[PDB]
Amino acid sequence: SMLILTRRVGETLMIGDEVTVTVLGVKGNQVRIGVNAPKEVSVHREEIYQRIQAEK
Amino acid sequence: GGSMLILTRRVGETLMIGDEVTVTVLGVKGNQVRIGVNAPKEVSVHREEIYQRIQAEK
Amino acid sequence: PLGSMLILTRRVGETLMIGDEVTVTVLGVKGNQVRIGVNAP
Amino acid sequence: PLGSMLILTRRVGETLMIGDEVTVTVLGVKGNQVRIGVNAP
Amino acid sequence: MSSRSELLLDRFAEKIGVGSISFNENRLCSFAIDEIYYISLSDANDEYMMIYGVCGKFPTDNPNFALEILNANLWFAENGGPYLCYESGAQSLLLALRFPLDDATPEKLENEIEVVVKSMENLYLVLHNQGITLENEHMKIEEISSSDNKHYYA
Amino acid sequence: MSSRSELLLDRFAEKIGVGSISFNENRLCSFAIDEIYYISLSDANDEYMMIYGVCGKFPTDNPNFALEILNANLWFAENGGPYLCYESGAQSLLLALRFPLDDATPEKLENEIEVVVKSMENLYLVLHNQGITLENEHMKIEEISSSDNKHYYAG
């Protein structure tokens, strides 16, 4: 279930009860993204996480 | 005549200054010499040009 | 100024992992508007 | 395998300081032999 | 006129959009990248410029943290990235990167500052994943604390 | 041999006369320059080689020491390497410096290693003047304790 939505710079979306994602800015096709999440909730660049796990 | 005592030492030989400092010629390669120094922990050892620039920071 | 907020950069097509089962993908960008894809647990 | 010995390289014409009163200068080199200039009280 | 680093800095300021950035008594200036990242520039030598990405106040209580930062310098060395450093005057954690002034261009200066910013992003992510958030104080490097040993560190 | 990095290592072991040197299981080979300085080489990737100068065992008591080492990285950054680092496996202080494999000759590799050696000497010197001598334990790096965060440590 992939939820597709739209936000503008300065706007926010909630994921669950403890995580909020903020659209901080746009430069070209790059989006600055803010994340509020607890300590135990890890944040990863997905391509970096996949390279980590590809090495066993 | 810049140095008071001039002498020669071969690789593996030793020169003593006083009785608490020992200078060892460890190796020679080209015009650079590996030098070993045994000295008390409070006696400081410096490359003279680096010490001069430590003085340059007035 | 933003407190403990973690700030990342994501280009169109790049994905962000949150936790073990949440992913956020930048699906498109124009102006100050971006489209986001959130995979739900 | 040199223990607590302090080791440093000196080119011909470079000087080594020991304490405040002693200097050791590499004056010349031939083969495995070195000419050393020493200043000490 | 100006040194070719001061002229480069004014030209980079106009290209990025910050009003007027100038070096100070200690040949240091500080500014904000996208109003998020504190970058300081040092006009130390006429052959190189220093880029400092101030990450945050160094954890006063964590002895393992310094060792983890040193251990991360391994992989920063592999990737040719900036150096993880500690500024003792402000007790800040820094990312330091040398920028050569020969063939220097505002485009290259921006791209190297971007490398510093990207490294800051990835470090902030790693620190967050370890449950660490660095305090945000003394982010503008007014002055670097000097040491006698700095001339030997080469 | 299967890379220009292996051919570089073989020609370098010939030029120095350290005998037969070969990258091990983890592509880490350790040797001694002048039978004095412990240096390890890692075939990091197909584009770069890593030169590690193992200074000694990291002090266990002084926490301020880690702060001094970190502060020293400021000035090592001004002078173009090497990097003062900590290796978690052997608990050792070391100087790391990458070597480009483009146009790489054993003379260049030897000169870069000499830059590591000069830095090791300077570090030994400043530690002695501070009153510190590093214990000489676990000098040969056969394996590097890897961190999952290594892929994030880049710009």
Numbering used by the authors:
A (entry chain H): 0 to 55
B (entry chain F): -2 to 55
C (entry chain G), D (entry chain E): -3 to 37
E (entry chain A): 1 to 154
F (entry chain C): 1 to 155
Give verbatim lines from the article.
The result enabled us to make a new CsrA construct that reserves only a single CesT binding site by linking CsrA-Cdel with full-length CsrA via a ten-residue linker (GGGGSGGGGS). Inspired by the high homogeneity of the CesT/Re-CsrA complex, we used this protein species for crystal screening and managed to collect a dataset of 2.3-Å resolution. The final model contains, in the crystallographic asymmetric unit, two CesT/Re-CsrA complexes which are essentially of the same structure. As expected, each complex is composed of two Re-CsrA molecules and one CesT dimer. In the complex structure of Re-CsrA bound to CesT, however, the chaperone molecule adopted a quite different dimeric fold (denoted dimer form B hereafter). Overall, Re-CsrA utilizes its intact CsrA-dimer part composed of helix α1, strands β1′, β4, β5, and their intervening loops for CesT engagement, contacting mainly the β1–β2 interloop, the long α3 helix, and the swapped terminal helix α4 (from the other protomer) in the chaperone dimer. A series of charged and hydrophilic residues were observed to locate in this second patch, forming a strong polar (hydrogen bond and/or salt bridge) contact network. These include the Re-CsrA residues R31 located in strand β4, K38 in the β4–β5 inter-loop, and V42 (with its main-chain groups) and R44 in strand β5 interacting with the CesT amino acids D34 in the β1–β2 intervening loop, Y37 in the β2 strand, and E121, N122, N129, T133 in the α3 helix and its following loop. Superimposition of the two structures on the Re-CsrA/RsmE proteins revealed an extensively overlapped region between the RNA binding site in RsmE and the CesT binding site in CsrA.
A central player in this system is the CsrA/RsmA protein which is able to bind the ribosome-binding site (RBS) of target messenger RNAs (mRNAs) and thereby repress translation initiation. The CesT protein is a newly identified CsrA ligand in E. coli.
